[PDB]
Amino acid sequence: VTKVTARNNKITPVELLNQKFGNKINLGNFADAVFTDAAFKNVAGIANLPMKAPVMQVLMENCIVSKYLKQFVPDRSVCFVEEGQKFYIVLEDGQKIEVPEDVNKALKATVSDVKHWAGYLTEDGEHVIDLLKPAPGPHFYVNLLIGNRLGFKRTLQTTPKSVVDRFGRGSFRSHAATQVLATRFDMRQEENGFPANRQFYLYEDGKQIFYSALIDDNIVEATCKHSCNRTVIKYKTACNLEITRTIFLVPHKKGFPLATELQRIEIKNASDKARNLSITYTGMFGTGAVHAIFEDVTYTNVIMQSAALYNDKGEFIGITPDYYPEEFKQDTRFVTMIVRNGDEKSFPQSFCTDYNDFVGTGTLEHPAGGCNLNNKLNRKGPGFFALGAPFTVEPGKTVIIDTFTGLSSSKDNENYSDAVMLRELDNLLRYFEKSESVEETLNEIINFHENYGKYFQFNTGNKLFDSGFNRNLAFQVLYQTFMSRSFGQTQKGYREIGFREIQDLFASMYYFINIGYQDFVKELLFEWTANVYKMGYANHNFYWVGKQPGLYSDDSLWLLQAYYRYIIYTKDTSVLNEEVPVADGNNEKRAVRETLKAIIQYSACISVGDHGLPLLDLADWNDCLKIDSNSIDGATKEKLYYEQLKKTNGKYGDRFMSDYSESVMNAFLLKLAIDHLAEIATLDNDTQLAQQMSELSKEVTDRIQKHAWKENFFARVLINRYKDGSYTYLGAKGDKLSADPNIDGVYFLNSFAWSVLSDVATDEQIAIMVDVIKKHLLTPYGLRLVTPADLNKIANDTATGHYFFGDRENGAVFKHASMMAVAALIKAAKKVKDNELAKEMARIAYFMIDLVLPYKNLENPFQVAGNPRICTQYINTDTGENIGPLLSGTATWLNLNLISLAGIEYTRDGISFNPILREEETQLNFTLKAPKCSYKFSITKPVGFARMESSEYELFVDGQKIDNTVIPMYTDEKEHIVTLKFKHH
Amino acid sequence: VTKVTARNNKITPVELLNQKFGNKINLGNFADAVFTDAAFKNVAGIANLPMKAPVMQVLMENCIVSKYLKQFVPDRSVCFVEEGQKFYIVLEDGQKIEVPEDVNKALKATVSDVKHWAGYLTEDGEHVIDLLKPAPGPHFYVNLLIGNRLGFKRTLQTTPKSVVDRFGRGSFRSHAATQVLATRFDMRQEENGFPANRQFYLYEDGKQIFYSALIDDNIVEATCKHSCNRTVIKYKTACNLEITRTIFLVPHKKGFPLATELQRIEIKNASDKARNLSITYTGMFGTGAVHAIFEDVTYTNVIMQSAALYNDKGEFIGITPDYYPEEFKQDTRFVTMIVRNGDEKSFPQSFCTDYNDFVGTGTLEHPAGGCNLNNKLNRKGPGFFALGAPFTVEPGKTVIIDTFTGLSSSKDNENYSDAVMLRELDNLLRYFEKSESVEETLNEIINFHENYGKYFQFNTGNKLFDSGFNRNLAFQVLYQTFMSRSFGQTQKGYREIGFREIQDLFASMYYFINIGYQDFVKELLFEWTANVYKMGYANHNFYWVGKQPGLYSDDSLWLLQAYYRYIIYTKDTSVLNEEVPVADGNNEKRAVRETLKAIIQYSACISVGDHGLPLLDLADWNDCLKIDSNSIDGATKEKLYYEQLKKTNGKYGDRFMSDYSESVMNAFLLKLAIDHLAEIATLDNDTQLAQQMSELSKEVTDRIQKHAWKENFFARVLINRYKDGSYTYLGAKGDKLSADPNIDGVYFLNSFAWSVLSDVATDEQIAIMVDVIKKHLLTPYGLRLVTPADLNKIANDTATGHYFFGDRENGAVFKHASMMAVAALIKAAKKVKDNELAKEMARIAYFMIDLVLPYKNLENPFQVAGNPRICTQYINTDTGENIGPLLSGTATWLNLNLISLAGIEYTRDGISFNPILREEETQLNFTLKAPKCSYKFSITKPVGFARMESSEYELFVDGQKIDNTVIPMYTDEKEHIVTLKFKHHH
Ligand SMILES: [Cl-]
């Protein structure tokens, strides 16, 4: 027997359709096709579609069309062609046959609005999704909801988060990986949570008429609306019922439970007769013993039971899971329902807590015992629940059903017990007693996010771009500030906060400072600073406490960038005097200034190699550069360094002798950190530190230029353990480590990116590196991280590849690294003397940006997939598809790059204004917010590339012409108009 | 707000029904009820049921009955009563109302055959299950299938196993935890595998008419039949189609894939017109990156793609998942289908490797794109597959569809690659080319399992008991021998073979030796012996290599029992001269005799405490006895012992000085091991070793009697770290560690069990311990492992418990320990001088056995649950429910106890015959096999307790009266008749 893989099947159905029917009928620009048999010999297809879409998949789903096609498809190839609003089927012999009337109607209905099969974005950037259409990808129809713990304790560690799909499916978490609603770990990326979560059934006379997660013949229209931090789903039934589901997380208030999700269900009777209905709201609680799910499911079942909840009047209101083991009694979950007939209030009348009893002989979509619940409290788990309530809807009236699903934790209370949960639940239910309270809370959420996004507002003509930046990107930046990489559609494991993830704060910081939350930014800075050891290295991860001390060599250097941004923007140098605990513990404290100095010393004097550059250690920002198999962490290095000092009679600050490899990216980060510290010291009137840092910066730049530049590129790694000279560096021409015979040497994008960002590379080096990037690192789908490399030569135990070509490490386009490179290109284009080179870099930067903007994913959704409102991780260079997860560094650097392209850069003297517009653009207007003032920026130019470095321009501030391009930060609480006009040449 | 837990809700619906209707109508012996509202104030129920069953749930599932009940509930309580073949509804005010005709008909239909709602057992012990009825428990409707790797390499590590439920759902594994069909790790115990596994749809004219996992209005009848190593499911449709699915694992043959599961689907047209139908067979391949499922699902999806398979003629035959990473490339999976119209052969015409496309806008039960597959090969995972084929069934004819789902592995081939899988698949498909080949293979499986269980055959009048022992228990013992505790309905993680699990071989050994596989038993013995270190300790776990050296103090001592059983039965002492590798590695080998001597020395001279008994170390057979928080494993103790010997100028064999605790269970195991080694040496003509072992046994018995007996019981552990005397022992009266104020001291069942089994306890001590057991350790649901204990005075970090009362460690009845105690009781009842004491112990033993026999679970299925063909782990002492998993030590010791109660015991001189029958029994007939002969045993007695120790009896062998009760092992290939008649008293 023989085997044929998916990738080895060269001929696609569309190619075969083009071959068979290309020269006989007009196939248009896009068409769809499907093989009619397992031999891949004949195809059935449809021609002239507005865009690529799985039209044949939907057509085969139709009984009439399938029946009609069955008389040709098995043996003959057919194609559908529309002429004069009339459909014909074309065979391989040229026969054109008019299809019957019913087939014609079915085809006309199907091909209608094909361009909207993936939904569309409103003027506010909200995604409107049809529930009956195929999904471009597992992440396309996903929305992320977050809580609000601002003004409370451990904001990062206690903010609730949730993921909601087009049908309301997903999971809900409270802190770390604590599950309120069960998460599903299965084979499919689409299944994030237990299927029963957030779903409900409506019964009329004991017979099911509605299920919230099934679109049947009784539903005439069903749509979902994904917006910022809330989801709305609307159904219309053939029996004239209007159903509206609104799902959102409750912002925290004093006395509330730690996590609470609210779903409001509005049932409106659009008929002229009163209807007596019943609602059954189902769900599944998440288990406390997550590990046991994979080890002992019986253990998870037998350690918990169900309990009923009653109010002060003795009426059943909800269910909770009760755990025996003490470790699982520190969190208490709850679900409650309330029914409002305008002003009358009623509570659920029945409940079920057994999945087997609920489903019975039916299925989850058609449960056999879904209407009449047995009211039996299960003695075991899992925490499945269903609450049933009857009600009556008068003609033209509406009934509301509010469901609160939440969790109380000991992480926010002392002497925690179930009594605490009961008290917090009582407070929550008292707060949401009136019907209008829910609407007020929703409006509060909406207004909070609208106001948060007002730090920077684009006002161009492109409504989609304006909405995507002003609302969607700002919300994603806030989300990645609170969570880092912990939760998502396919991010379901337990993850701690990585030290370098402070990169997120690079952007969100500004927003937070402009809604009066500067103290929150300071607290985040101090929390990160608390994870730096006395020597200078930092913990790699931390949620409640740090771990993995000094495992990676780059972690500590991002803190300098964060502090520089904060201090430059706010001018608040007092943070340097704050006493923060050191990661070593023992109740020792150190000033922030000393911690920054220690970081610089560790990365510049102690942990350095033979060439004076920082050591690679286990790895750096790039986790695949595991060159040294005998690497050591921070603590081992510290003890060995002290032993060396004692033995050699050295002094603290001397180099730690070894033959380990050196990282050039770390060298660039160190140079940038030293420059930032020099600027901070200058702002702090510390002249001695400023001049010392300036001299150290010059020394480090000289070392990098002398040892890292290799006549074609900046090397990525310097190798020191091969005395014979077989291998000495990696990441430039002549390194002898290229796995591609057509490429002489390996090239890393980060090399060029952070050589430009650190301000080490010169103009000639920038030009050479840009040429190399265009030659090798630039692909039709963007800038790839690195060219193929054969690391087995220098690291024998490097293992082999894990991914097909184009996926992740096998030549994919990582959007985070590409965005960093785009930042470097933007920075270079502002100051490079050569105008042609600047124009080329600007073109490359805009080309790369166009591949990352989420909204543009809706241009060809069924080819690029991704998500039209949330940034994804990487692009598959084999197919061009955008692949999750939804949380990554793409959003932060995209926001920074878009703001910098507008010309905004914060320096010691104010805003350094230097916009770089698109060639086709002729106008750019935006509004900027600042503590104590605001700006209205307008830029005008003719068609073509224009920049302040090599173009004639006029700049006015408040109507007064000015010469210097640095606009001061005003403090008069007024709005200042800035106008730039590029003269036509 | 306030909360009420399930256990705090004291009043049950049935109690309230009795209160409200008890004195007004006859409720019979059993009834069912449900609360009508969340306040638990009113009930609706039905009276006079044959047995407890969830009748009200089924009634609520009925639209007519629910509509009728809505007119009274939830405001008023109602009860259904059947008088004069007509149904009435009774209210709390005495009103009796005759229900309408439709309601009466529905109630009559539902109340019928309530006594068979959980199925029934055939005369062959096969479970017949109705697919429309509720499940007593998550394990009740489960069947386990195993392969056959006998005569091949690494039988334990390479035998395939599978679990099949009443609907055919489950998973399928090849070796270790390698998944052929996807396993599901979710919140529910019922979901063992992916829902689509082993399922198919039938379409007619493009419209779905049948789904194998859904019972709808088109299904008239649907039943499943669980038998030994095969499952059969039958459906009848309203359109006159008869569907039958037969699922079983293929026994291995040369050139076959390592794992292969075969499902045969027969479609018979019972109408008078030809039907043009289409079949779509679906499934999900298991992923190679199991950890990535919880870590990174995207990684799991992106590292694999789909590939199509074609035969020599170029015709599509199936799908396979193709992996890029090298680690997930040593195993290659496949699924293939073939359609037979009697003699004409055809292959699937379409396929769909994509769950989203298959389901479309519908569901898995009603897929939207299930009829017309898109024939698209997915570039990503997961390995979902559907194969579609059309066919035509003529009137009165049958169409067969054979599906082979399997896996080839590098564990059985050198230079493995995907080409090896193609070659093995070609061999398999060539073998199963004719239609009758599948039937021949099924008959071969059936005959093999029928012949395997002929070592011991009961021939009593109770057909259920005879089938449960002769067929079901034998198969379970074989299954546990091949898979110790690795796979099951709820045993879904990765587990290795524990050393203790050698206990399984205690039973299955005999069967194997009587089926021609003595060499297999020897290979298993040597494989276990290879995990014993030179010092004497053993690895705790091992699948391909051992791990955790000497982590537990009892592991090495079971090997002596295994060797004793084997050598005594076969008299093959040559195994003692075999050279086996030592667990230390370095290519060092040792003779078996020396390994046994080293085990004895380690447990008797080196690893001992202040009292001279074996050290507890981290723990012993009981994993909850973590008394010492500074325990060390075998290697640490070995290096410390060597440095101590060097420092103190000692010699090898001296005690390892320490203040660690001692285990009395280990002491009993050591005494039994020493006695066994003495007997082996005597059989081997090694007089010096026999004398040395006899003296050592006497000395160890003296130590145990002097330091372990505490005037009321045998202590469980001895404490040596408290010099002030605050605590010195645990497991007897006055130990000061009892957590129950009404019980003075803690008592362990294993203490008595292994004091009797090791032959250390005396008659007076046995009587005292039996009294204590009756006082404290005997409950209405059996013998509990241990009375409540504190264990916090001596171990500060002991935790606070994880289970509600009656579950596992919080007072449950563990069937394995109870069976060991029953073995001790049986052994004592045969030899104690006091006849009343023997009668009491026999009564207790039979009472405990009646709670463990799987078939009796069908007497009150909806209250005890369990499984009517497979033994479970423990009984919940709060409710009496039997709880899984299905694999445990219960089956082995139940088999041993049943055989011993029949009077069979193998000694040096032959069979020691000493039956112990039930008091009510008057006849016991059975047949026994020996490697060179066979016996027919018949025992007759009057009503009442009778034993050879205290009753007058006549024993005839081959018609000749004999005096000595030891029947020799004949070697003349004849059948010998043994008759034992107990004389009527007086
Ligand atoms: Cl995600």
Ligand SMILES: [Cl-]
């Ligand atoms: Cl890199």
Ligand SMILES: [Cl-]
């Ligand atoms: Cl199991």
Ligand SMILES: [Cl-]
């Ligand atoms: Cl024990």
